[PDB]
From a paper:
The role of carbonic anhydrase isozyme IX (CAIX) in tumor cell survival, proliferation, migration, pH regulation, and cell-signaling pathways made this enzyme a promising therapeutic target in oncology. , Tumor cells primarily express two membrane-associated carbonic anhydrases, CAIX and CAXII. These isozymes belong to a family of zinc metalloenzymes that catalyze the reversible hydration of CO2 to form HCO3 – and H+. Although the active site is characterized by conserved amino acids between 12 isozymes, the amino acids further away from the zinc ion provide some variability. Crystal structures of CAIX and CAXII with five compounds by using soaking or cocrystallization were determined to confirm the binding mode of the ligands and reveal insights that govern enhanced affinity.
Four ligands in complexes with CAXII are of similar structures, contain a cyclooctylamine group at the 3-position and (3-hydroxypropyl)­sulfonyl tail at the 4-position, but vary in substituents at the 5-position: compound 9 has a (4-hydroxybutyl)­amino moiety, compound 10 - piperidinyl, compound 13 - methoxy, and compound 14 - ethoxy. Compound 10 with cyclic piperidinyl group retains a high affinity for CAIX (K d,obs 0.29 nM). A complex of CAXII-10 is present in structures containing two and four subunits. In all subunits, the ligand adopts a consistent binding mode, with variability in the cyclooctylamino and piperidinyl rings. Additionally, the para-tail hydroxyl group shows positional variability, as it is exposed to solvent. The meta-piperidinyl group in compound 10 is well-stabilized and tightly packed against the hydrophilic cavity wall, with all conformations being similar. Like compound 13, a water molecule is also found in a similar position and forms hydrogen bonds with Y6 and H67. However, there is no direct interaction between this meta-substituent of the ligand and the protein. The sulfoxide linker of the para-tail is stabilized by a hydrogen bond with N64 and Q89, except in CAXII-10, where N64 is too distant for interaction, but in one subunit 3.4 Å hydrogen bond is still possible. Interestingly, despite the bulkiness of synthesized di-meta-substituted compounds 10, 13, and 14, especially the first one compound 10, which possesses large piperidinyl and cyclooctylamino groups, ligands acquire quite similar binding poses in the soaked and cocrystallized complexes with CAXII.
Author numbering:
A (entry chain B): 3 to 252, 255 to 263
B (entry chain A): 4 to 253, 255 to 263
Amino acid sequence: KWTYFGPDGENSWSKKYPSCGGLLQSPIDLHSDILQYDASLTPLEFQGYNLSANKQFLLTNNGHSVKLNLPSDMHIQGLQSRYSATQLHLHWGNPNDPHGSEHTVSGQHFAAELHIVHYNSDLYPDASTASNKSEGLAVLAVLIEMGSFNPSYDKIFSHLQHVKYKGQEAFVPGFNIEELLPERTAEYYRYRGSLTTPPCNPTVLWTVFRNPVQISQEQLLALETALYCTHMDDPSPREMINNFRQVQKFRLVYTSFSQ
Amino acid sequence: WTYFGPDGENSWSKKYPSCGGLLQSPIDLHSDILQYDASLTPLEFQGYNLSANKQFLLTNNGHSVKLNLPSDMHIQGLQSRYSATQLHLHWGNPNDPHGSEHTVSGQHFAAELHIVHYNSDLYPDASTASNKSEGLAVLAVLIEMGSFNPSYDKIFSHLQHVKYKGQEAFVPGFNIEELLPERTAEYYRYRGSLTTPPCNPTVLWTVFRNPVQISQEQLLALETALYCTHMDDPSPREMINNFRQVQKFDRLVYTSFSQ
Ligand SMILES: NS(=O)(=O)c1c(F)c(NC2CCCCCCC2)c(S(=O)(=O)CCCO)c(N2CCCCC2)c1F
Ligand SMILES: NS(=O)(=O)c1c(F)c(NC2CCCCCCC2)c(S(=O)(=O)CCCO)c(N2CCCCC2)c1F
Ligand SMILES: [Zn+2]
Ligand SMILES: [Zn+2]
């Protein structure tokens, strides 16, 4: 129904998905003129993130990105409701332009971005029900840049070889998802926004950590070159690249750090 | 169509199919998509010194302010002669005075001037040209906050007479080349589109490398003088943030400079 490229690309999402042309759209450029320090923004607590290595979690190529299913016993503590995990997934660019984060900082894209999606389990019974409702979603965003090899990210990336094509799936043994978060999680940007893909509902409480994580040049290249958005038997195969939405016009972004 | 709300830029494709098509402008000018082209030679600006005995219509059309230009103003150096039709501006707002259309290495400038031309070797007028490939050529000048600019003030001194949609004022001829920056020989060149509906992908863009300056007071005037609504409208709407977000570009921008 929708794509990141071509005639069904992001400027056309609003035809079928009205909220994509509505208010509170994400992602955004995090820059000085729209920030405000909020001393009340305390560190979140990440509970249940240490997933048992005896359990397995489904990784799927759905044609738009790769996503890992997460159990609802994982949750964020510190918001007005409990938010319980549902999935994590990534957004990236391409080897010729390896700058495919969704959020930018002072107009700069990072190489990639990880989103850990949660739903308000105090108010709603599941993520689908929560997704178009008040206070329904909370997403944690980790900016990713090129640097040292990252063994924790490789716990996902080592499986990309088995989800090359749309509709393919692989089981990933549990590991500590907190390993994917950066140093100093206390420093973050906080704002009310939306899903960054259709249906673009304006129901997401975003937390974008200030500090990026690093993955190696080779890990980033693998992420950018391993996957296809087409089924294996498609006579017109299409590489899965540039699967991020452009920044949206933006209204205040609160920061847990004063400078 | 508008730049904010239900008829804003993510909705333009609902009515204007080209706004969701290929070759859309503006774009972020950054290293990964740039290629030096030693063959790109300086444009020559012919007829830009408009007679002071003549006058040129300035119009608030509800989306920006535009100044009509005569077809005896020409650019030489492209594959055809292109003749002027108008100039106009794009800007931000006082709380976020960063409303250029093009960005450079992810940074918005305060505003941007467009001087629109059409291929007069092939087409009799800009309307005809606008639907034809490379029918149009636009010169873009990036504008930053700095010194007072007496040349731009030859346009800005009139803003208080075109405050509302449909209002018009005459501007005596002056040297339009005074609106251009230093070292016009240095520029970015790419094939793109109109940045407003109908978004036709028919524009040869030239973005000069170097910005010009206007003062904080001049920028504030440009950001606060104009309304998108008619004078008698019971709910006035300020004309601010009348720039399109940057578009995906994955394709090369050629530069006339290497360093
Ligand atoms: N970037 S984002 O964090 O906004 C965000 C989400 F949040 C959710 N998941 C949400 C919660 C679970 C499903 C219920 C409906 C809301 C989607 C999802 S999703 O898997 O559920 C797809 C449906 C929405 O397009 C995605 N995708 C986009 C397609 C590629 C994989 C990740 C997304 F990018
Ligand atoms: N940013 S841009 O340079 O792409 C660009 C153009 F080029 C043209 N003028 C072109 C040539 C003259 C008229 C023929 C049709 C194509 C528009 C125009 S225009 O006046 O002709 C309006 C066309 C609306 O469909 C505009 N506007 C947008 C609204 C505010 C004033 C300037 C524009 F922003
Ligand atoms: Zn996402
Ligand atoms: Zn313009």
